[PDB]
Curated annotation (Swiss-Prot):
Ca(2+) 2 binds at D90, D92, D94, K96, E101. It comes from the Eukaryota. Belongs to the parvalbumin family. Transmembrane segments: none annotated. Keywords: Acetylation, Calcium, Metal-binding, Muscle protein, Phosphoprotein, Repeat. Residues 38-73, 77-109 form the EF-hand domain. Pfam families: EF-hand_7. One of its GO terms (molecular function) is identical protein binding. This is Parvalbumin alpha.
Length: 109
């Protein structure tokens, strides 16, 4: 889980409070979820949870799957988010998010 690091409450509200909004851009959700509340290391703690067999990074395509890790209560990465959230979080512009970019996504939102 990611409650000891990331604000457990935030993730609960941010995830279940935005059905369509976050559906467009989770960036804002990134703020409400409380991912910024901590540092890249803290947020990364979940990255190890979700990025278990992603070889260090998840692909925008599969990103919509791994999404449920946190979003299991909300929706997943759709066309909009793949291009919006993945392409954003992965500011480096690699179409994917790895241990390196997962820190950048914190600076994004």
């Amino acid at each position: 889980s990611m409650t000891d690091l990331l604000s457990a409450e935030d993730i609960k509200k941010a995830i279940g409070a935005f059905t369509a909004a976050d559906s467009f851009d989770h960036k804002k959700f990134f703020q409400m979820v409380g991912l910024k509340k901590k540092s890249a290391d803290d947020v990364k703690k979940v990255f190890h949870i979700l990025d278990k067999d992603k070889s260090g990074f998840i692909e925008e395509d599969e990103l919509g799957s791994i999404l449920k890790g946190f979003s299991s209560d909300a929706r997943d990465l759709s066309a909009k988010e793949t291009k919006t959230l993945m392409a954003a979080g992965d500011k480096d512009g690699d179409g994917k998010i790895g241990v390196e970019e997962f820190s950048t996504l914190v600076a994004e939102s």
